[PDB]
Amino acid sequence: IGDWRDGREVRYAVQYASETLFSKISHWSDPVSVREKACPTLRMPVDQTRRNVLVFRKFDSSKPQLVGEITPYLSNFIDIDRDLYNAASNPDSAVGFKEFTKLNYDGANIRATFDHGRTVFHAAAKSGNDKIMFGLTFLAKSTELNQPDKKGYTPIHVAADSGNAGIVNLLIQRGVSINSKTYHFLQTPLHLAAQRGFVTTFQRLMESPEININERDKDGFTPLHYAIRGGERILEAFLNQISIDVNAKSNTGLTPFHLAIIKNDWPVASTLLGSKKVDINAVDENNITALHYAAILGYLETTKQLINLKEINANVVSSPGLLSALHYAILYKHDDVASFLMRSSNVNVNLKALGGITPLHLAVIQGRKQILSLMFDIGVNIEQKTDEKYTPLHLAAMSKYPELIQILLDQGSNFEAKTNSGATPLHLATFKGKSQAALILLNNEVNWRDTDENGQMPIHGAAMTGL
Amino acid sequence: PFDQIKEVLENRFNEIDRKLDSHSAALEEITKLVEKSISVVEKTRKQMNKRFDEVMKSIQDAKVSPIISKINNFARYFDTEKERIRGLKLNDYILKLEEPNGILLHFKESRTPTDDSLQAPLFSIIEEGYAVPKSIDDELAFKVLYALLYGTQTYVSVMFFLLEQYSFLANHYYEKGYLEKYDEYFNSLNNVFLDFKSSLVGTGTSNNEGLLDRVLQVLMTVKNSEFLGLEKNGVDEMLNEKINLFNKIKEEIEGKQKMTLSETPENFAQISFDKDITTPIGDWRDGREVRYAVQYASETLFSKISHWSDPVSVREKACPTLRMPVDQTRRNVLVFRKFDSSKPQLVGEITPYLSNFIDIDRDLYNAASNPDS
Amino acid sequence: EGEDLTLEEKAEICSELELQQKYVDIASNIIGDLSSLPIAGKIAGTIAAAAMTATHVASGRLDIEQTLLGCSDL
């Protein structure tokens, strides 16, 4: 029965149950041979210090197991416990049931707690033994069927997390707390079922009354958000039900579509769109859409998948700065997705951001040859102006890569344009502090008698730098 | 003598057999990388071996002599050990590589049994900078710079030798079926790669821990120096070749950010015994324990096996059923099974979208291999 | 003007890679502001938290001077 087998070895040890400081385990006792009898009884002398004693048991060099706690004035400590718990955890069904009933025939403690508050009900839930669960639920109270462990996992949470279905049905028929939440995570059994991808458990859970699909958690994520981990079956099971908040938002405002897009996998997004209820233009707390995430992460295949055959608005901008997703593609050196976005019919290349920022200006700043080639090929205006009216030639001069302005020289860009200050680009080129970036303009024979609003001239610009 | 030819044919045959039995796309890619990385530096180092040998006797100053002595001793130990290890048989190769206080252990921290190391002298010579040509000729400075270049190339060579040896050992022990030893060699390969990368390029080069950029800046400074230069035409060409080679090797090293796949899958969530099969069959016996492990099936890189699960006792039931959670990355997963302390066995493969995995297929294969009819 | 001016130095901290690691630190300081990142990690991988941090940092007004010297990108 259990771990008791003929020819094995038994060792015992004792410890102080201290809740503040680390204790020490005594040296293991002498070997005890195992024979026809299995369950022993230990006579414990009364402790001199009047403390509770924890008992540890080991079998022939296996991993030791805690078997009980004894009060100072308790004698004849029977080791019948920790075997009923092991019997309920037996992967086999008939053997476990026989061991359970034999140990219960001889006075086994149902209420004993092992493995951080896990009772026999938790062990039966993890193993999925339906017979012992039915026998326990036949005569039981609701206070023990809903008893959480140290981590907050009630038996229904363990049953849902292990993928078992029959025991979940048994607890549903008997009646247990369904919307119970764990500690520090506040995860319902639906969250655990969705995070792993079990369909039968989800169906059994939804068969019960008094259950909401849209239950939140610590960070505001619904089970539909957790269904992203499940590939196709659990998401379809979610979409098959009656009342689902498909566009549910978390604390930050993220939607399940946002999670599917940011994870870079299309089939889940297609399955979610199959419900014909997903709002593509859903925004975040900073007015960020799924297309913005795709542009900022370079997911070009998903970008093509979502941009075509769909009614999507590609002109949505973030509220703080009115900065579009094509600006995201331009930034962080994402040339291919930006080039694809430019050729799209429903994408505006001339869109402006806060401060009069155009995509061409950021392309010039980032020094991307391919994007500027697309700018020339498409036919976008080269003389775009900002609120402070720095020309693209000005930004090319100010950029860390001078070799841009050279190919801007042959495009007909005016080199005498001035900003709010009446200073030519050569005047501003001396102020930035770059040496080699100014030689490629000096050879063009640019005038040297221009005055700005404050009166300075190019010789003053190099005086403060040292070019 | 005929035995001299016979011994060399033994060495060549052993090398070919060693480079043939270990077949895997992982070693294919690793060997291609290491050969395209080493070829040029190995050839130039072989060409300049004799030049450094005549450099050794040209040093007379007592302050700098120990540095070149240490570098030469390490180089002699390294190439002598390579020559000794090249021609041995596969079994002898494994035994020599797998031994306490071996050549690999000395190579990891770059020391020798006769307490000779090069990394500390290499850092010390850069720290003070005797290589700068203060004098109009400063011949000893040129010799010191040449020794520094030799040491850097030898350090890169020993890096790549360690990498290829560890990869070969790991794949050999993975194909043999020893999961524990393959795991330990996997960890050693990852650790040595990380440490050598941090030693060459630095963790963001904030403190200039890397030595590649330091020697690059020293070469740039001596090139920019004009009065200190000796005006010789060949000096410019050789420093140009050194700059090109070091830039190429630095780009090659910085190209990769990892060597192997360190991601770990998730093991089974629940195990049961549903099929009615009494268990005087196969390896399933009463009183035995079974452990399971999972791995990512990768055809281009080296994966990592998950930690073995809790032991499961075998009583009256043989074939278990395992419930597998859906993979986050949607990758096929290899499953390994071990009985007690016996050698682990691969039992099958599981798809991302199928949960109930039954371990009954390998038992039939073992049943067909039973010596008893 | 003022001799005790670090405008050139301030341009260097926006271009130095070591000071770009300091720009990572302020990006790493957003973990206190938003505690929803770890749960996003278990669902959409590690890249989810990085993407949210990047969007939060880059959502505001863009500055030309900061972008010129190269500490706007990372």
Author numbering:
A (entry chain B): 375 to 841
B (entry chain A): 95 to 467
C (entry chain B): 21 to 94
What does the paper behind this entry write?
The potent neurotoxic venom of the black widow spider contains a cocktail of seven phylum-specific latrotoxins (LTXs), but only one, α-LTX, targets vertebrates. This 130 kDa toxin binds to receptors at presynaptic nerve terminals and triggers a massive release of neurotransmitters. Each monomer is composed of an N-terminal four-helix connector domain (CD; residues E21–D115), a central helical bundle domain (HBD; residues S116–K350), a short β-sheet plug domain (PD; residues Q351–D453) and a C-terminal tail of 22 ARs (ARD; residues I454–G1195).
The architecture of each subunit of state 1 has a characteristic G-shape and is similar to that of the soluble α-LCT monomer and the δ-LIT dimer19. The four HBDs form the core of the tetramer with a central ~12–15 Å channel and the ARDs extend to the periphery, in a four-bladed windmill-like assembly. Direct comparison of the cryo-EM structure of the N-terminal helices α1–α3 in the prepore state with their AlphaFold2 prediction in the pore state suggests that these helices undergo dramatic conformational changes to assemble the TMD: In the prepore state, α1–α3 are isolated within each monomer, with a distance of ~60–80 Å to each other, and are bent into a total of five shorter sub helices (α1a, α1b, α2, α3a, and α3b). The tetrameric prepore is well resolved in this region and shows that the introduced VPRG residues are placed N-terminal of the last β-sheet (β7) of the PD domain, disturbing the crucial intermolecular oligomerization site between PD and neighboring ARD.
